Every structure is written in C-alpha cells, then in structure tokens.
Design a binder for this molecule. Structure first.
Ligand SMILES: CC(C)CCC[C@@H](C)[C@H]1CC[C@H]2[C@@H]3CC=C4C[C@@H](O)CC[C@]4(C)[C@H]3CC[C@]12C
Ligand SMILES: CC(C)CCC[C@@H](C)[C@H]1CC[C@H]2[C@@H]3CC=C4C[C@@H](O)CC[C@]4(C)[C@H]3CC[C@]12C
Ligand SMILES: Nc1nc2c(ncn2[C@@H]2O[C@H](COP(=O)(O)OP(O)(O)=S)[C@@H](O)[C@H]2O)c(=O)[nH]1
Ligand SMILES: C=CCN1CC[C@]23c4c5ccc(O)c4O[C@H]2C(=O)CC[C@@]3(O)[C@H]1C5
Lengths: 286, 55, 344, 335
C-alpha cells in the first residue's frame, strides 16, 4: 500500500541529492578551479557520468508509480541506452582514475611523461567511445512491448533469446564487477604498500597521520564502491540463474539494490571531489 | 685611493647649479597640463579610434 | 576580411604556440638541482664524478646561430689589425677595405669570406702585426679563428662541435651541467660565480626539485683567512640555516653531502673534536663524530613536518652518490605526483 | 682624516639642498583638479609563456613588445592582434632583463650568465639570430636599454654600469661609484643621460659622453628595484622595497613627492610614466599594480587581475596602452 510511496520518495531524494552534488562539482570545476590537471578531467567526466546516470531516475520512479510506461518507445530506448552507457562510463573512469593514481605512485619516472593533459583527454575520449561501442548494440534492439494491458519496454533479443540475453548478463557482470574490483584493489594495494615504504609519510606523528588518512580515504573509496555495487549484480545474476516467486519482498529488495547503485553514483562526488585537498584549498579561499 | 676619489667625486657633485623646488615643480606641473589633452590614459579616448577593441 | 597577411600571421603564431608547447612539455620532464657549497667544500668533485654528458643538447640549433658572431668577430679582428698597423702592401689594404665595406653591407658568405681567407695568408707580416697587436687587449682567439676557419667555405658550414665551444662566451656565474641517470634528466646549477648578493637571485630558482648543499667535514677545526676569527663549519651552518629558513625554499628537499670523509678520519686522530663544538665531548672515533656532525647539521630544519633532508657521506668514487640523488629525487617526484593527484 | 672632510662637505651638499627647498610639490599642486578615479580593463591577455615573467619592454612603433620569462623564451608579442611574431630560444634560462631597440631592429636580454645577448630581428634569412654577446661583467645583468643601433647601456651585479659598442663588444665607458648592486636603469628621452638605482638605496645620474656621475639621490632607505625618467627628462621616479615610490629631481636634486600608503607594505618591482607624465604606474608584490597621480600623490586606480606578483611594467610611447607582465606567465594590456 505505502511501499510504492516510500520507494518513490527514496528515488526522489537520491535523484535530487545526486543531481545537486554533480551540478555543484561541475560548477566548481568550471568556475572556481580550472580543468588543467589530468585528475580534474577525470573528476569532470565522472561528474557527467553520475549526473547523466541519475537523470533517468524520475522516469523509472513514475514508471513504478503508475505501473506503466506512458513515455513512448524512443524515450525509453535512449533511457536504457544511456543507463548502460553511464554505468560503464562512471565505472571505467573510476578504473582509470585508480590506474592514474597507481601510475603516479609506483612509476614516477613514467608518470612524468604519461600524466599529461592530452593523454588524459585521449584516454577519456577512448573511454566514452568504448562505452558507446557496447551501448549502441543496445540502442538498436531495445523496444516497447505490451503485457497484460500495461506498457513496459524491457529490451528484447533475437530468436535465441536466452543465449544473447545471458551473454549480455554475464558480460556486464564480468566487466563492470570483476574488472573494477580486481584493478582497483591491486592498484590501490600496490600504491598503499609503496606509500608505506616511502619516507615522507613515515617516521613522525604528522607523517603517519597523513599516511593513515590516505589509506583510510582509499579504503573508504573501495568499500563504498564494493558495498553499493555489490547487491545488485549478484541479485541480478540469481534472478537470471533461478526463477524467483513474485513477492513484495523481492520488489523492495530489487528497488533497494537499484537505489544502492545510484547512491554510489550520488556519493562519488562527495568522496572524489570534496575530499580532494585541491578542492579544499579552493574552498578555504572563499 | 678609493677614499680620495670618493671625496673628489662627491665634491664635484657639490658644486653644481641648483634651481628652487618651486620652479622645478611648477614647470613639471606645466608639462603635465600641456599634454593632458593628448594622453589617452588620463582621458579615455573614444573606442572608434582606440586600437584595442574586442573582435 | 583578414587576407593573406593576417592569415600568415595567425599561422606563424600557431607555429610558435606549438613550439612553446613541446618546449614546455620537455622542460616539465627535467629535474632542477641547485648545487650550493661554501669555499672549497667539494662541489668540483661532485660535478666531476657525474661525467656523462655536459655539452649535449640542441646541437642543431647551436650551429645555426653563431654564424653572425663568427663574421662579426672576424671583421672586428681585421679592422683591429688594420688600426694597429697604424698609430708594396697597398693592394691587399684596398682588398681589406673592400671586404670591410662588404661586411658592413652584410654580403653573407659567398664572396667576402673567400677573399678574407685568401689574401691574409699570402703575406708574411700578418703574424708580426698580430704579435705587435698583443700590447693592447684584443680578441683571445682571432688568429685561432683565422687558421681554423679557412679550411671550409660552405654557405652552411658545420665543421666541428669545438666551434660552438670556442665562439660561445664562458659563463662566469651560473654554470649548467646536464646529465642523465636511469631514464631521468638532471640539470644541476653551480652559483659559485655570482658573488654579489644572493638575496636577489635565490628567488630566480624558487621551485627547484632539490638542493645539493655540500659541506666539507674536515673544516671543523679550520679557521678562515678573513680576520682569523670565523670557523668554516660554523659559516657552513649559518649558510644552511639561511637556506633552510628561506621563504623561497620552504618545502624543497635538501640533500646534504658531507664530502671530506677521509680527511676527517685523518683529522680526528690528532686533533680534538671540541674546537668546533666546545659543548660536545663524546668520543674521538670517526663514526660518532660524523654522526654528531650530521645530527647537529640536520636540526637546522625548523619545519621538519614538511621538509625532508637526505644526508649522505661521500668521499672519493661513490657510484651510490648519484644513486642517493636519484632516490631523493624520486621521493620528491612521488610527493609532487601525490600533490597533483589530490592525495597528499 | 679626510673622512671627516667628506662628511662635512656632504653636510654642505644636503644643507644646500635643504636651503634650496622653499615649497613642496604638494603645496604647488594643492589647487589643481585631481584625475579622480580611473578604470582600466584588460583588452589583451598575452598567453603563451609557461614560466615566471621578469622583464618587458615596449616598442617605438607602439605595437610590438617583448617579454622574457624563466622558460628560456623571449617572445615578441603583438598588442593589436595578439600574435607571437618571434620566440627566441635563450642559451641562459636565468634572465631578468630584456630591451627593444629604438629602430625596432634589435632585441636584448641578459641575466645570471653575465652576458648581454643581442639578437637581430630582421636578418636576411627571416628568422632571429645572435649578433653579439657582451662580456665583461661579473654580476647578474638586471636592466639593459638601447641608446641607438650601436650603443647599449647595461646595469650589472658588479655594482657598475657600462656603455657598450655593438660591433666591438667592449665597454667604451664604465660608470663606477655605486656601493651596491644596481638593479634598474632608465635612458633619458634625449639619450644623453641615464639614471640608475642600486641596493644601497641611492640613485645616480651619469653622462653618456664624459662618463662621470653628476648627481646622487639618497631618499630611499631599503634599495632601488625600478627607475623611470619623466617624459621631459627633468625628473624621474624610483621603486624600492620599503613600500614607497619617490619622485626625485634633476635641476633641484631632492625628493619632491612621496607616493606611499599605510596598507601597501609590499615592495615595488616596476615603474613607468605615461605621455603626459601625470600618471605614474607602479607594479607591486601584492599581485596588483597601483596607479598613482604624479602631482597629487594619491591612488587613482588599481590594475588587478594578476594572481601572482607583478614583475615588469611599461607604458607605450604613444600612451595608448599599459602592459603588465607578472609571475603567472601572462601579460595584460590596459586602457
Ligand atoms: C551527451 C552524451 C549522450 C554524448 C556523449 C558525450 C561525449 C562524446 C563527451 C562527454 C564528455 C566529453 C569530454 C568532456 C571534457 C573534455 C575536455 C576538453 O578539453 C576536451 C574534450 C573532452 C575530453 C570531452 C570529449 C567528449 C566527451 C567525452
Ligand atoms: C553482498 C552483501 C553485502 C549483500 C547481499 C544482498 C543481496 C544479495 C540480498 C539482500 C536482500 C536479499 C533479498 C531479500 C528477500 C528476498 C525474498 C525471498 O523470497 C527471495 C530472495 C530475496 C529476493 C532476497 C534476494 C537476495 C537479496 C537481494
Ligand atoms: N684529499 C681530498 N681532496 C678532496 C676531496 N674532495 C675534494 N677535494 C678537493 O677539495 C677541493 C675543493 O675545491 P672546489 O673547486 O670544489 O672549490 P669551490 O667551492 O670554489 S667550487 C678540490 O681541489 C678537491 O681536490 C677528498 O675526498 N679528498
Ligand atoms: C544502479 C543502476 C545501474 N543500472 C544499470 C543497468 C541495469 C543493471 C544493473 C546491474 C546489472 C545488470 O546486468 C544491469 O542491467 C540493467 C538491469 O537489468 C536493471 C538494473 C540496472 O538498470 C542497474 C544495475
């Protein structure tokens, strides 16, 4: 009775907070601080991916509220296309940001001639191109169907429906879950070990406090990403693995998993720009 | 060696002609309001003849 | 609306923009080292034990610039020898006046240089006139240019790399040494020549990667010749104090090189250690004395929470001295990359 | 001995200066209308440097200037269309002086390398070459100015100025007498005198012809970082480090007017005058230039927009522009 009301309210609050945070990050990164450093380009593209990922949230909230899709076929064609696009752009820019920090730590000589702004630009262009190269194979197949007198536009596949469907499921699972957790943990772990071995963060109370703060703000990044993306992927893979009885509990759990993924998209600017010390320096000047 | 040449240099700086502060300040000011209608910084020239304009 | 003149101006400025772009990106990969040191502290040994490359760099750009310098030096030398002749030999004098007029009218290299390298060597009194010209101060390598320039007459002549060395004036002040070590480029500056006021050119660096402040260990019991009242290690300490407590160098790392190690080991056995430090009398061995000198020299860092000092004892060969420089520099680069990544 | 004689006749000199003062410049300009508040805007920002700019000189054609920075580049800009005409690769990155010839054919530079390099801007090849390097100085070259196509006067770190001849590379005249590092010189409009200031907080005027100091000015107390002649050549202004610009004098030999404020305690790096001479522009270390009234000794306006310390400044010869180079690799032209 009131489950739809509270899930619509939670969708609304996560959408508005995510949009406001990413708009603040874009406003700061355009007006106050510039876009000269490579990390600024990375957090700019992450902000765009998070803002465009959470902009489809009112559509899905009113889709659940009204029990139907009154927005036609092309609108949700681009909505599911841009959702598959945005999850990969945000995930891959997290991956390349962690690779950037690992290169800046463990390979300093190579990071002198690798961490140039044009290199970051071509990496991000290749990033959005490679996300598009798998979002456009979704663009030409998503469509609007009719079931039980109601309108829904889940994506529909070819005559071997299960083969192509499960191929998409296992591919998005392996890429956007196994690829970021492995890359992020190995890169950040090697970076943290090298920071443990380096002189400037060891041998004093202030230096050890700085090292502990860096390790804490790396571990919270990995923990927030893993916790927020972890229920939805395995829940989708067990929905695809075994059939599940339709219950209010499974609907609320599904919507909470969606909310947790979009909460990662909402909280990325909090722990990726507001916790950066350059942005803090820009903030204390005004 | 250095002290005696310093003495003679500063004593030949001693015996030079000097006009009053009033006369020099007065004709400096006279030079100031003789070119005042020419200086573009004091009086901003119109943008038609100004060569520094947005394109 | 802009036509060919403004289009060519825009194209030339775009070319200058690209050239500045690669030059700045190349200069960002360098590492700047500011080598300091007191009187005979051992900077020359530190420089000369890094002998890899010193004249290497922009070799193509070097040889295409000083051609006007060569021509102007040649015309200055020939007009100087003509003027020093005064104060059977008139046709060559008219020829020298003609090449004087040609050099005043530029003339490039096709006609005048062949005449000036042909007619001068025909006579025999040219050497006598040049010897008589040594009474006054003149060019130090005029006849050197004359007898090492006549062999080539090409319009774009690239005889040797020694020509760039002999034409370029030796810098009395700032000294540049550019060596590479393990895929990383180092640019070390010696400021020994500049001896007027360091307070107005220390800000001219303001952002070097590291300092190579060198101190001789054996100057603890030595005294200066200036009034015989100042210890040399004490003025080394006061220079280190001024460098550490400097507004332009407030976070850069200082790599202290305690250089006269074997002389310190010779001096400890016959001379007391209380001359430099009257309040210190701990032992007489090399290890504890050198460690106490290093400890009394490292406490001058008044901001130890941000600035790091990497002290090494080097004596004679020490291949690991450059390795110590490289380790300190890579630590500084790691700190800079952490500053760039929004982590530190 | 004769030290007391020197002290007593220096006492005679400044006693004659004190007796020569009957009315200050404040009282003689206490009735003229002020310039009020003037507003200047950056019409051109000359991006393209990548390091710390230290020097700038305008051109006699009022269109092309030159500025030098710490990247080893000497860029001749364009005030009109913002075009980089030239960019010379310097053999010494440590430079804080640059000069532009009155004929517009030559450009100079120098610094810690003890070398005043001269470059020909209009060679037959079309590019920029190196014509002559002026050697003979044992200190850092702080300011050089071109008298003409043949003579150039330089101030060095060895507490001596020098007048050179280009085709011989020899100092035809040496200007000794400074007990401190000269940091700036300004040529007279009639190219017959020049005045230089040093770290001993004194300014000295020299004759180019007979090569001996004529007047000395001991108004400042910290040092002298900048100096600039008046357009008529009968006065000059001096920058220093005690937050004061002082307008000295030639025919009266005193400190006429003090341009100081109790909130601008930073130093001064650069000074210039407009065509009329009523507008003394001074660059400061608090990231912005102050515009002073040369008769009323009050600030007219502030030239903001630089986030780093202003280092060099110059008013163009026809008075239609003010270019300020600072420590942020940018130049700014104002109206
Ligand atoms: C609007 C959506 C659906 C279309 C896809 C947008 C793509 C093509 C856009 C979005 C973000 C963009 C990047 C954002 C910022 C920069 C920095 C700029 O200095 C160079 C271009 C670069 C690197 C852009 C390249 C193109 C880009 C990747
Ligand atoms: C990995 C850790 C941190 C979190 C795991 C969360 C996921 C896998 C859990 C959390 C809540 C769970 C749901 C809770 C309730 C039900 C109703 C039941 O009739 C079928 C299973 C179903 C639908 C569960 C599926 C799995 C689920 C979505
Ligand atoms: N026996 C012995 N001598 C050493 C050692 N290291 C350096 N020297 C000498 O110390 C002088 C410094 O002169 P230098 O040019 O650096 O001065 P400077 O400050 O004006 S540049 C040089 O002649 C060196 O032979 C050493 O281990 N053992
Ligand atoms: C948190 C939102 C991210 N979304 C991306 C696309 C999708 C999705 C997620 C996880 C795994 C998938 O295979 C997958 O496809 C989609 C699906 O089947 C519905 C749920 C999602 O909209 C959601 C998270």
């Amino acid at each position: 009775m009131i489950t739809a009301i509270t899930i619509m309210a939670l969708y609304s609050i996560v959408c508005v907070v995510g949009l406001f945070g990413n708009f603040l990050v874009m406003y700061v990164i355009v007006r106050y601080t510039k876009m000269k450093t490579a990390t600024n380009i990375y957090i700019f593209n992450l902000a765009l991916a998070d803002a465009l990922a959470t902009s489809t949230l009112p559509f899905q909230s009113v889709n659940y509220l009204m029990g139907t899709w009154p927005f036609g076929t092309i609108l949700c064609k681009i909505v599911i296309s841009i959702d598959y696009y945005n999850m990969f752009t945000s995930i891959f820019t997290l991956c390349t940001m962690s690779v950037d920090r690992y290169i800046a730590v463990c390979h300093p000589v190579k990071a002198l001639d690798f961490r140039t702004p044009r290199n970051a630009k071509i990496i991000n262009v290749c990033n959005w191109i490679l996300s598009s190269a798998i979002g456009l194979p979704v663009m030409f197949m998503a469509t609007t169907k009719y079931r039980q007198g109601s309108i829904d536009c889940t994506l529909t596949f070819s005559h071997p429906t299960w083969y192509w469907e499960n191929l998409l499921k296992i591919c998005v699972f392996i890429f956007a879950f196994i690829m970021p957790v492995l890359i992020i943990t190995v890169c950040y772990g090697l970076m943290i070990l090298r920071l443990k071995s380096v002189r400037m963060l060891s041998g004093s109370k202030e230096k050890d406090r700085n090292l502990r703060r860096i390790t804490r703000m790396v571990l919270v990044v990995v923990a927030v990403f893993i916790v927020c993306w972890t229920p939805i992927h395995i829940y989708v893979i067990i929905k695809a693995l075994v059939t599940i009885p339709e219950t209010t509990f499974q609907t609320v759990s599904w919507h909470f998993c969606i909310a947790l993924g979009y909460t990662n998209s909402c909280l990325n600017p909090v722990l990726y720009a507001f916790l950066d010390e350059n942005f803090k320096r820009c903030f204390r000047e005004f | 060696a250095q002290a005696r040449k310093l003495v003679e240099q500063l004593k030949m700086e001693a015996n030079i002609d000097r006009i009053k502060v009033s006369k020099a300040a007065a004709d400096l000011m006279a030079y100031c309001e003789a070119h005042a209608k020419e200086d573009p910084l004091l009086t901003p020239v119109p943008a038609s003849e100004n060569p520094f304009r947005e394109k | 609306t802009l036509s060919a003149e403004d289009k060519a101006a825009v194209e030339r400025s775009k070319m200058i923009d690209r050239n500045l772009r690669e030059d700045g990106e190349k200069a960002a990969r360098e590492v700047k080292l500011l080598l300091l040191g007191a009187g005979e502290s051992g900077k020359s040994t530190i420089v000369k034990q890094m002998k890899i490359i010193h004249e290497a760099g922009y070799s193509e750009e070097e040889c295409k610039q000083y051609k006007a310098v060569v021509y102007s030096n040649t015309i200055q030398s020939i007009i100087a020898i003509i003027r020093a002749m005064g104060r059977s030999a008139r046709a060559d004098d008219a020829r020298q006046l003609f090449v004087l007029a040609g050099a005043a009218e530029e003339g490039f290299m096709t006609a005048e240089l062949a005449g000036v390298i042909k007619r001068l060597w025909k006579d025999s009194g040219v050497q006598a006139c040049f010897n008589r010209s040594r009474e006054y101060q003149l060019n130090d390598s005029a006849a050197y240019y004359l007898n090492d320039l006549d062999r080539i007459a090409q319009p774009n002549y690239i005889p040797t790399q020694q020509d760039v060395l002999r034409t370029r004036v030796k810098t009395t002040g700032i000294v540049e040494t550019h060596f590479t070590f393990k895929d990383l480029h180092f640019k070390m500056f010696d400021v020994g020549g500049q001896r007027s006021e360091r307070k107005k050119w220390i800000h001219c660096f303001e952002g070097v990667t590291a300092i190579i402040f060198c101190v001789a260990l054996s100057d603890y019991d030595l005294v200066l010749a200036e009034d015989e009242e100042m210890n040399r290690m004490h003025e080394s300490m006061k220079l280190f104090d001024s460098i550490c407590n400097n507004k332009w160098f407030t976070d850069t790392s200082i790599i202290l090189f305690l250089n006269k190690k074997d002389l310190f080991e010779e001096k400890i056995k016959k001379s007391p250690l209380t001359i430099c430090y009257p309040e210190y009398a701990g032992s007489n061995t090399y290890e504890e004395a050198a460690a106490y000198i290093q400890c009394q020299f490292e406490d001058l860092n008044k901001r130890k929470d941000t600035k790091e000092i990497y002290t090494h004892f080097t004596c004679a060969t020490d291949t690991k001295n450059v390795q110590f420089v490289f380790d300190a520099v890579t630590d500084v680069i790691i700190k800079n990359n952490l500053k760039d990544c929004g982590l530190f | 001995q004769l030290r007391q004689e020197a002290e007593q006749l220096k006492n005679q000199i400044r006693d004659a200066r004190k007796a020569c003062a009957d009315a200050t410049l404040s009282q003689i300009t206490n009735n003229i209308d002020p310039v009020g508040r003037i507003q200047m805007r950056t019409r051109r920002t000359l991006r393209g440097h990548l390091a710390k700019i230290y020097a700038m000189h305008w051109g006699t054609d009022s269109r092309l200037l030159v500025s030098a920075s710490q990247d080893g580049k000497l860029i001749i800009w364009d005030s009109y269309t913002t075009n980089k005409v030239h960019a010379i690769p310097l053999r010494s990155s440590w430079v804080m002086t640059c000069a532009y010839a009155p004929s517009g054919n030559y450009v100079a530079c120098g610094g810690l390398d003890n070398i005043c390099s001269i470059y020909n801007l209009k060679t037959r090849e079309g590019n920029v070459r190196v014509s002559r390097e002026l050697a003979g100085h044992t200190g850092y070259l702080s300011c050089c100015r071109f008298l003409d196509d043949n003579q150039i006067v330089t101030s060095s770190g060895d507490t001596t100025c020098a007048l050179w001849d280009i085709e011989t590379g020899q100092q035809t005249t040496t200007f000794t007498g400074h007990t401190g590092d000269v940091m700036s010189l300004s040529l007279a409009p009639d190219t017959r005198l020049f005045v230089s200031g040093a770290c001993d907080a004194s300014a000295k005027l020299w004759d180019v012809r007979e090569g001996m100091c004529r007047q000395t000015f001991t108004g400042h107390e910290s040092d002298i970082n900048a100096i600039c002649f008046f357009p008529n050549g009968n006065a000059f202004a001096t920058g220093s480090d005690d937050a004061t610009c002082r307008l000295f004098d030639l025919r009266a030999d005193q400190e006429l007017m003090t341009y100081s404020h109790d909130n601008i305690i930073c130093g001064i790096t650069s000074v210039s005058f407009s065509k009329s001479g009523r507008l003394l522009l001074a660059g400061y270390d608090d990231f912005n230039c102050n515009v002073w009234d040369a008769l009323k000794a009050d600030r007219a306006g502030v030239l903001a927009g630089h986030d780093n310390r202003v280092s060099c400044l110059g008013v163009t010869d026809d008075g239609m522009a003010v270019a300020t180079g600072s420590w942020d690799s940018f130049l700014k032209i104002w109206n």
